[PDB]
């Protein structure tokens, strides 16, 4: 689990969104595994607006933050799962790192701010849903 709290927005994995998230919906995209809902309180996270390919992510199944090198956001085939049919997921970045299903939502960050959240994994890989192109998260 986990979310990004920027401005009056809560960014979560679409597959982990709550009923309250759907009832306060701003935007969602199944092809990216992202959903954004509105919040009453202002958050403290800042979104990175950069080209970093190195950063640090939080792994809840280890209670640890790990430094990683990650690929540029791309269209990657993601196997049918209990959350989606077999499909290509867009804006996904891969790295070598430990992950388990409940690690989704952990933040990946660089020196500029939050880069994305854990969305996929297995066999010593971890995939992150990028948010750096979502410029509207910085306004309204
Ligand atoms: C982090 C992690 C580790 C092990 C496994 C996973 N699973 C669990 C099942 C669903 N997906 C796919 C989600 C999607 N974005 O389509 C995973 O990759 C995640
Ligand atoms: Zn950066």
mmCIF file with all atom_site columns, C-alpha atoms and ligand atoms in Angstrom:
data_model
loop_
_atom_site.group_PDB
_atom_site.id
_atom_site.type_symbol
_atom_site.label_atom_id
_atom_site.label_alt_id
_atom_site.label_comp_id
_atom_site.label_asym_id
_atom_site.label_entity_id
_atom_site.label_seq_id
_atom_site.pdbx_PDB_ins_code
_atom_site.Cartn_x
_atom_site.Cartn_y
_atom_site.Cartn_z
_atom_site.occupancy
_atom_site.B_iso_or_equiv
_atom_site.pdbx_formal_charge
_atom_site.auth_seq_id
_atom_site.auth_comp_id
_atom_site.auth_asym_id
_atom_site.auth_atom_id
_atom_site.pdbx_PDB_model_num
ATOM   1   C  CA  . UNK A 1 1   ? 0.000   0.000   0.000   1.00 0.00 ? 1   UNK A CA  1
ATOM   2   C  CA  . UNK A 1 2   ? 0.966   3.694   -0.199  1.00 0.00 ? 2   UNK A CA  1
ATOM   3   C  CA  . UNK A 1 3   ? 0.141   6.983   -1.849  1.00 0.00 ? 3   UNK A CA  1
ATOM   4   C  CA  . UNK A 1 4   ? 1.664   10.292  -2.997  1.00 0.00 ? 4   UNK A CA  1
ATOM   5   C  CA  . UNK A 1 5   ? 0.080   13.337  -1.259  1.00 0.00 ? 5   UNK A CA  1
ATOM   6   C  CA  . UNK A 1 6   ? 0.773   16.442  -3.403  1.00 0.00 ? 6   UNK A CA  1
ATOM   7   C  CA  . UNK A 1 7   ? -1.382  19.560  -3.097  1.00 0.00 ? 7   UNK A CA  1
ATOM   8   C  CA  . UNK A 1 8   ? -5.010  18.439  -2.733  1.00 0.00 ? 8   UNK A CA  1
ATOM   9   C  CA  . UNK A 1 9   ? -4.388  15.170  -4.586  1.00 0.00 ? 9   UNK A CA  1
ATOM   10  C  CA  . UNK A 1 10  ? -3.877  11.563  -3.450  1.00 0.00 ? 10  UNK A CA  1
ATOM   11  C  CA  . UNK A 1 11  ? -2.124  9.372   -6.069  1.00 0.00 ? 11  UNK A CA  1
ATOM   12  C  CA  . UNK A 1 12  ? -2.553  5.602   -5.631  1.00 0.00 ? 12  UNK A CA  1
ATOM   13  C  CA  . UNK A 1 13  ? -2.283  2.386   -7.651  1.00 0.00 ? 13  UNK A CA  1
ATOM   14  C  CA  . UNK A 1 14  ? -5.670  2.109   -9.473  1.00 0.00 ? 14  UNK A CA  1
ATOM   15  C  CA  . UNK A 1 15  ? -5.848  -1.565  -8.442  1.00 0.00 ? 15  UNK A CA  1
ATOM   16  C  CA  . UNK A 1 16  ? -5.640  -0.567  -4.700  1.00 0.00 ? 16  UNK A CA  1
ATOM   17  C  CA  . UNK A 1 17  ? -8.049  2.434   -4.842  1.00 0.00 ? 17  UNK A CA  1
ATOM   18  C  CA  . UNK A 1 18  ? -10.701 2.567   -2.096  1.00 0.00 ? 18  UNK A CA  1
ATOM   19  C  CA  . UNK A 1 19  ? -14.426 3.372   -2.400  1.00 0.00 ? 19  UNK A CA  1
ATOM   20  C  CA  . UNK A 1 20  ? -13.651 6.844   -0.991  1.00 0.00 ? 20  UNK A CA  1
ATOM   21  C  CA  . UNK A 1 21  ? -11.066 7.327   -3.822  1.00 0.00 ? 21  UNK A CA  1
ATOM   22  C  CA  . UNK A 1 22  ? -13.684 6.423   -6.497  1.00 0.00 ? 22  UNK A CA  1
ATOM   23  C  CA  . UNK A 1 23  ? -16.289 8.695   -4.850  1.00 0.00 ? 23  UNK A CA  1
ATOM   24  C  CA  . UNK A 1 24  ? -13.772 11.671  -4.948  1.00 0.00 ? 24  UNK A CA  1
ATOM   25  C  CA  . UNK A 1 25  ? -12.206 10.845  -8.311  1.00 0.00 ? 25  UNK A CA  1
ATOM   26  C  CA  . UNK A 1 26  ? -10.039 13.294  -10.254 1.00 0.00 ? 26  UNK A CA  1
ATOM   27  C  CA  . UNK A 1 27  ? -8.458  10.996  -12.920 1.00 0.00 ? 27  UNK A CA  1
ATOM   28  C  CA  . UNK A 1 28  ? -7.763  7.315   -13.542 1.00 0.00 ? 28  UNK A CA  1
ATOM   29  C  CA  . UNK A 1 29  ? -5.973  5.312   -16.205 1.00 0.00 ? 29  UNK A CA  1
ATOM   30  C  CA  . UNK A 1 30  ? -6.000  1.504   -16.224 1.00 0.00 ? 30  UNK A CA  1
ATOM   31  C  CA  . UNK A 1 31  ? -3.158  1.371   -18.823 1.00 0.00 ? 31  UNK A CA  1
ATOM   32  C  CA  . UNK A 1 32  ? -0.873  3.187   -16.312 1.00 0.00 ? 32  UNK A CA  1
ATOM   33  C  CA  . UNK A 1 33  ? -2.284  1.529   -13.076 1.00 0.00 ? 33  UNK A CA  1
ATOM   34  C  CA  . UNK A 1 34  ? -2.896  5.047   -11.653 1.00 0.00 ? 34  UNK A CA  1
ATOM   35  C  CA  . UNK A 1 35  ? -5.804  6.786   -9.907  1.00 0.00 ? 35  UNK A CA  1
ATOM   36  C  CA  . UNK A 1 36  ? -5.935  10.252  -8.376  1.00 0.00 ? 36  UNK A CA  1
ATOM   37  C  CA  . UNK A 1 37  ? -8.542  11.393  -5.847  1.00 0.00 ? 37  UNK A CA  1
ATOM   38  C  CA  . UNK A 1 38  ? -9.132  14.738  -4.147  1.00 0.00 ? 38  UNK A CA  1
ATOM   39  C  CA  . UNK A 1 39  ? -8.165  15.458  -0.485  1.00 0.00 ? 39  UNK A CA  1
ATOM   40  C  CA  . UNK A 1 40  ? -9.383  17.930  2.123   1.00 0.00 ? 40  UNK A CA  1
ATOM   41  C  CA  . UNK A 1 41  ? -5.878  18.428  3.654   1.00 0.00 ? 41  UNK A CA  1
ATOM   42  C  CA  . UNK A 1 42  ? -2.820  19.660  1.697   1.00 0.00 ? 42  UNK A CA  1
ATOM   43  C  CA  . UNK A 1 43  ? 0.010   17.164  1.258   1.00 0.00 ? 43  UNK A CA  1
ATOM   44  C  CA  . UNK A 1 44  ? 3.752   17.528  1.572   1.00 0.00 ? 44  UNK A CA  1
ATOM   45  C  CA  . UNK A 1 45  ? 5.181   15.492  -1.291  1.00 0.00 ? 45  UNK A CA  1
ATOM   46  C  CA  . UNK A 1 46  ? 6.674   17.343  -4.278  1.00 0.00 ? 46  UNK A CA  1
ATOM   47  C  CA  . UNK A 1 47  ? 6.782   15.773  -7.800  1.00 0.00 ? 47  UNK A CA  1
ATOM   48  C  CA  . UNK A 1 48  ? 10.138  15.503  -9.592  1.00 0.00 ? 48  UNK A CA  1
ATOM   49  C  CA  . UNK A 1 49  ? 10.304  17.255  -13.017 1.00 0.00 ? 49  UNK A CA  1
ATOM   50  C  CA  . UNK A 1 50  ? 13.507  15.770  -14.360 1.00 0.00 ? 50  UNK A CA  1
ATOM   51  C  CA  . UNK A 1 51  ? 15.276  13.042  -16.375 1.00 0.00 ? 51  UNK A CA  1
ATOM   52  C  CA  . UNK A 1 52  ? 16.744  10.998  -13.463 1.00 0.00 ? 52  UNK A CA  1
ATOM   53  C  CA  . UNK A 1 53  ? 17.301  7.241   -13.989 1.00 0.00 ? 53  UNK A CA  1
ATOM   54  C  CA  . UNK A 1 54  ? 18.676  6.674   -10.461 1.00 0.00 ? 54  UNK A CA  1
ATOM   55  C  CA  . UNK A 1 55  ? 16.783  7.069   -7.194  1.00 0.00 ? 55  UNK A CA  1
ATOM   56  C  CA  . UNK A 1 56  ? 15.587  5.310   -4.026  1.00 0.00 ? 56  UNK A CA  1
ATOM   57  C  CA  . UNK A 1 57  ? 12.366  3.349   -3.423  1.00 0.00 ? 57  UNK A CA  1
ATOM   58  C  CA  . UNK A 1 58  ? 10.567  2.140   -0.289  1.00 0.00 ? 58  UNK A CA  1
ATOM   59  C  CA  . UNK A 1 59  ? 10.074  -1.624  0.049   1.00 0.00 ? 59  UNK A CA  1
ATOM   60  C  CA  . UNK A 1 60  ? 7.445   -2.401  2.766   1.00 0.00 ? 60  UNK A CA  1
ATOM   61  C  CA  . UNK A 1 61  ? 8.264   -6.178  2.729   1.00 0.00 ? 61  UNK A CA  1
ATOM   62  C  CA  . UNK A 1 62  ? 11.803  -5.287  3.947   1.00 0.00 ? 62  UNK A CA  1
ATOM   63  C  CA  . UNK A 1 63  ? 11.025  -2.020  5.862   1.00 0.00 ? 63  UNK A CA  1
ATOM   64  C  CA  . UNK A 1 64  ? 13.880  -0.522  3.831   1.00 0.00 ? 64  UNK A CA  1
ATOM   65  C  CA  . UNK A 1 65  ? 14.671  2.105   1.258   1.00 0.00 ? 65  UNK A CA  1
ATOM   66  C  CA  . UNK A 1 66  ? 16.899  0.822   -1.600  1.00 0.00 ? 66  UNK A CA  1
ATOM   67  C  CA  . UNK A 1 67  ? 18.923  2.763   -4.161  1.00 0.00 ? 67  UNK A CA  1
ATOM   68  C  CA  . UNK A 1 68  ? 18.133  1.674   -7.733  1.00 0.00 ? 68  UNK A CA  1
ATOM   69  C  CA  . UNK A 1 69  ? 18.899  2.338   -11.388 1.00 0.00 ? 69  UNK A CA  1
ATOM   70  C  CA  . UNK A 1 70  ? 15.674  2.267   -13.442 1.00 0.00 ? 70  UNK A CA  1
ATOM   71  C  CA  . UNK A 1 71  ? 14.708  2.263   -17.109 1.00 0.00 ? 71  UNK A CA  1
ATOM   72  C  CA  . UNK A 1 72  ? 12.984  5.148   -18.896 1.00 0.00 ? 72  UNK A CA  1
ATOM   73  C  CA  . UNK A 1 73  ? 9.162   5.088   -18.889 1.00 0.00 ? 73  UNK A CA  1
ATOM   74  C  CA  . UNK A 1 74  ? 8.020   2.600   -21.526 1.00 0.00 ? 74  UNK A CA  1
ATOM   75  C  CA  . UNK A 1 75  ? 5.286   0.267   -22.745 1.00 0.00 ? 75  UNK A CA  1
ATOM   76  C  CA  . UNK A 1 76  ? 5.979   -3.125  -21.069 1.00 0.00 ? 76  UNK A CA  1
ATOM   77  C  CA  . UNK A 1 77  ? 3.974   -6.359  -21.300 1.00 0.00 ? 77  UNK A CA  1
ATOM   78  C  CA  . UNK A 1 78  ? 2.465   -7.235  -17.940 1.00 0.00 ? 78  UNK A CA  1
ATOM   79  C  CA  . UNK A 1 79  ? 1.113   -10.723 -17.492 1.00 0.00 ? 79  UNK A CA  1
ATOM   80  C  CA  . UNK A 1 80  ? -2.658  -11.364 -16.653 1.00 0.00 ? 80  UNK A CA  1
ATOM   81  C  CA  . UNK A 1 81  ? -2.994  -11.051 -12.909 1.00 0.00 ? 81  UNK A CA  1
ATOM   82  C  CA  . UNK A 1 82  ? -5.887  -11.010 -10.368 1.00 0.00 ? 82  UNK A CA  1
ATOM   83  C  CA  . UNK A 1 83  ? -6.107  -7.197  -11.062 1.00 0.00 ? 83  UNK A CA  1
ATOM   84  C  CA  . UNK A 1 84  ? -5.858  -6.900  -14.894 1.00 0.00 ? 84  UNK A CA  1
ATOM   85  C  CA  . UNK A 1 85  ? -6.034  -8.999  -18.112 1.00 0.00 ? 85  UNK A CA  1
ATOM   86  C  CA  . UNK A 1 86  ? -2.724  -9.596  -20.066 1.00 0.00 ? 86  UNK A CA  1
ATOM   87  C  CA  . UNK A 1 87  ? -1.799  -6.193  -21.413 1.00 0.00 ? 87  UNK A CA  1
ATOM   88  C  CA  . UNK A 1 88  ? 0.808   -3.613  -22.112 1.00 0.00 ? 88  UNK A CA  1
ATOM   89  C  CA  . UNK A 1 89  ? 1.242   -1.133  -19.223 1.00 0.00 ? 89  UNK A CA  1
ATOM   90  C  CA  . UNK A 1 90  ? 2.421   2.304   -20.271 1.00 0.00 ? 90  UNK A CA  1
ATOM   91  C  CA  . UNK A 1 91  ? 4.788   4.770   -18.533 1.00 0.00 ? 91  UNK A CA  1
ATOM   92  C  CA  . UNK A 1 92  ? 6.369   1.867   -16.562 1.00 0.00 ? 92  UNK A CA  1
ATOM   93  C  CA  . UNK A 1 93  ? 10.044  1.873   -15.417 1.00 0.00 ? 93  UNK A CA  1
ATOM   94  C  CA  . UNK A 1 94  ? 11.841  -1.339  -14.350 1.00 0.00 ? 94  UNK A CA  1
ATOM   95  C  CA  . UNK A 1 95  ? 14.661  -1.892  -11.869 1.00 0.00 ? 95  UNK A CA  1
ATOM   96  C  CA  . UNK A 1 96  ? 16.375  -4.782  -10.099 1.00 0.00 ? 96  UNK A CA  1
ATOM   97  C  CA  . UNK A 1 97  ? 15.019  -4.883  -6.567  1.00 0.00 ? 97  UNK A CA  1
ATOM   98  C  CA  . UNK A 1 98  ? 13.053  -6.921  -4.146  1.00 0.00 ? 98  UNK A CA  1
ATOM   99  C  CA  . UNK A 1 99  ? 9.333   -6.604  -4.327  1.00 0.00 ? 99  UNK A CA  1
ATOM   100 C  CA  . UNK A 1 100 ? 6.094   -8.491  -3.227  1.00 0.00 ? 100 UNK A CA  1
ATOM   101 C  CA  . UNK A 1 101 ? 2.465   -7.713  -4.228  1.00 0.00 ? 101 UNK A CA  1
ATOM   102 C  CA  . UNK A 1 102 ? 1.752   -5.582  -1.100  1.00 0.00 ? 102 UNK A CA  1
ATOM   103 C  CA  . UNK A 1 103 ? 4.808   -3.389  -1.848  1.00 0.00 ? 103 UNK A CA  1
ATOM   104 C  CA  . UNK A 1 104 ? 2.662   -1.537  -4.474  1.00 0.00 ? 104 UNK A CA  1
ATOM   105 C  CA  . UNK A 1 105 ? 2.331   2.114   -3.506  1.00 0.00 ? 105 UNK A CA  1
ATOM   106 C  CA  . UNK A 1 106 ? 5.861   2.536   -2.165  1.00 0.00 ? 106 UNK A CA  1
ATOM   107 C  CA  . UNK A 1 107 ? 7.473   5.787   -3.427  1.00 0.00 ? 107 UNK A CA  1
ATOM   108 C  CA  . UNK A 1 108 ? 10.402  6.001   -5.833  1.00 0.00 ? 108 UNK A CA  1
ATOM   109 C  CA  . UNK A 1 109 ? 12.194  9.389   -5.424  1.00 0.00 ? 109 UNK A CA  1
ATOM   110 C  CA  . UNK A 1 110 ? 15.242  11.222  -6.737  1.00 0.00 ? 110 UNK A CA  1
ATOM   111 C  CA  . UNK A 1 111 ? 17.019  14.441  -5.646  1.00 0.00 ? 111 UNK A CA  1
ATOM   112 C  CA  . UNK A 1 112 ? 14.166  16.473  -7.313  1.00 0.00 ? 112 UNK A CA  1
ATOM   113 C  CA  . UNK A 1 113 ? 11.220  14.820  -5.566  1.00 0.00 ? 113 UNK A CA  1
ATOM   114 C  CA  . UNK A 1 114 ? 8.792   11.930  -6.117  1.00 0.00 ? 114 UNK A CA  1
ATOM   115 C  CA  . UNK A 1 115 ? 9.236   10.054  -9.386  1.00 0.00 ? 115 UNK A CA  1
ATOM   116 C  CA  . UNK A 1 116 ? 6.541   7.357   -9.128  1.00 0.00 ? 116 UNK A CA  1
ATOM   117 C  CA  . UNK A 1 117 ? 5.100   4.432   -7.132  1.00 0.00 ? 117 UNK A CA  1
ATOM   118 C  CA  . UNK A 1 118 ? 5.700   0.672   -7.130  1.00 0.00 ? 118 UNK A CA  1
ATOM   119 C  CA  . UNK A 1 119 ? 3.127   -0.964  -9.499  1.00 0.00 ? 119 UNK A CA  1
ATOM   120 C  CA  . UNK A 1 120 ? 4.615   -4.398  -10.553 1.00 0.00 ? 120 UNK A CA  1
ATOM   121 C  CA  . UNK A 1 121 ? 7.314   -6.907  -9.564  1.00 0.00 ? 121 UNK A CA  1
ATOM   122 C  CA  . UNK A 1 122 ? 8.576   -10.440 -9.006  1.00 0.00 ? 122 UNK A CA  1
ATOM   123 C  CA  . UNK A 1 123 ? 11.812  -12.469 -9.412  1.00 0.00 ? 123 UNK A CA  1
ATOM   124 C  CA  . UNK A 1 124 ? 14.091  -9.687  -8.256  1.00 0.00 ? 124 UNK A CA  1
ATOM   125 C  CA  . UNK A 1 125 ? 12.478  -6.996  -10.458 1.00 0.00 ? 125 UNK A CA  1
ATOM   126 C  CA  . UNK A 1 126 ? 10.396  -4.020  -9.361  1.00 0.00 ? 126 UNK A CA  1
ATOM   127 C  CA  . UNK A 1 127 ? 8.329   -1.796  -11.743 1.00 0.00 ? 127 UNK A CA  1
ATOM   128 C  CA  . UNK A 1 128 ? 7.285   1.802   -11.043 1.00 0.00 ? 128 UNK A CA  1
ATOM   129 C  CA  . UNK A 1 129 ? 4.428   3.841   -12.491 1.00 0.00 ? 129 UNK A CA  1
ATOM   130 C  CA  . UNK A 1 130 ? 5.980   7.184   -13.511 1.00 0.00 ? 130 UNK A CA  1
ATOM   131 C  CA  . UNK A 1 131 ? 4.140   10.410  -12.535 1.00 0.00 ? 131 UNK A CA  1
ATOM   132 C  CA  . UNK A 1 132 ? 6.711   13.028  -13.750 1.00 0.00 ? 132 UNK A CA  1
ATOM   133 C  CA  . UNK A 1 133 ? 4.741   13.815  -16.940 1.00 0.00 ? 133 UNK A CA  1
ATOM   134 C  CA  . UNK A 1 134 ? 1.501   14.626  -14.970 1.00 0.00 ? 134 UNK A CA  1
ATOM   135 C  CA  . UNK A 1 135 ? 2.111   18.358  -14.801 1.00 0.00 ? 135 UNK A CA  1
ATOM   136 C  CA  . UNK A 1 136 ? -1.369  19.142  -13.538 1.00 0.00 ? 136 UNK A CA  1
ATOM   137 C  CA  . UNK A 1 137 ? -0.527  17.500  -10.155 1.00 0.00 ? 137 UNK A CA  1
ATOM   138 C  CA  . UNK A 1 138 ? 1.359   20.805  -9.393  1.00 0.00 ? 138 UNK A CA  1
ATOM   139 C  CA  . UNK A 1 139 ? -1.687  23.108  -9.775  1.00 0.00 ? 139 UNK A CA  1
ATOM   140 C  CA  . UNK A 1 140 ? -5.412  23.687  -8.816  1.00 0.00 ? 140 UNK A CA  1
HETATM 141 C  C1  . LIG B 2 .   ? 5.437   -5.261  -6.527  1.00 0.00 ? 1   LIG B C1  1
HETATM 142 C  C2  . LIG B 2 .   ? 4.974   -6.618  -6.997  1.00 0.00 ? 1   LIG B C2  1
HETATM 143 C  C3  . LIG B 2 .   ? 5.669   -7.765  -6.656  1.00 0.00 ? 1   LIG B C3  1
HETATM 144 C  C4  . LIG B 2 .   ? 5.203   -9.024  -7.010  1.00 0.00 ? 1   LIG B C4  1
HETATM 145 C  C5  . LIG B 2 .   ? 4.046   -9.154  -7.757  1.00 0.00 ? 1   LIG B C5  1
HETATM 146 C  C6  . LIG B 2 .   ? 3.339   -8.008  -8.111  1.00 0.00 ? 1   LIG B C6  1
HETATM 147 N  N1  . LIG B 2 .   ? 2.136   -8.100  -8.862  1.00 0.00 ? 1   LIG B N1  1
HETATM 148 C  C7  . LIG B 2 .   ? 1.010   -8.732  -8.145  1.00 0.00 ? 1   LIG B C7  1
HETATM 149 C  C8  . LIG B 2 .   ? -0.164  -9.004  -9.070  1.00 0.00 ? 1   LIG B C8  1
HETATM 150 C  C9  . LIG B 2 .   ? -0.454  -7.835  -9.987  1.00 0.00 ? 1   LIG B C9  1
HETATM 151 N  N2  . LIG B 2 .   ? 0.781   -7.313  -10.576 1.00 0.00 ? 1   LIG B N2  1
HETATM 152 C  C10 . LIG B 2 .   ? 0.597   -6.513  -11.791 1.00 0.00 ? 1   LIG B C10 1
HETATM 153 C  C11 . LIG B 2 .   ? 0.017   -5.160  -11.468 1.00 0.00 ? 1   LIG B C11 1
HETATM 154 C  C12 . LIG B 2 .   ? -0.052  -4.244  -12.660 1.00 0.00 ? 1   LIG B C12 1
HETATM 155 N  N3  . LIG B 2 .   ? 0.479   -3.044  -12.489 1.00 0.00 ? 1   LIG B N3  1
HETATM 156 O  O1  . LIG B 2 .   ? -0.552  -4.628  -13.723 1.00 0.00 ? 1   LIG B O1  1
HETATM 157 C  C13 . LIG B 2 .   ? 2.039   -7.447  -10.068 1.00 0.00 ? 1   LIG B C13 1
HETATM 158 O  O2  . LIG B 2 .   ? 3.014   -7.153  -10.719 1.00 0.00 ? 1   LIG B O2  1
HETATM 159 C  C14 . LIG B 2 .   ? 3.796   -6.753  -7.715  1.00 0.00 ? 1   LIG B C14 1
HETATM 160 ZN ZN1 . LIG B 2 .   ? 15.369  13.823  -10.512 1.00 0.00 ? 2   LIG B ZN1 1
#
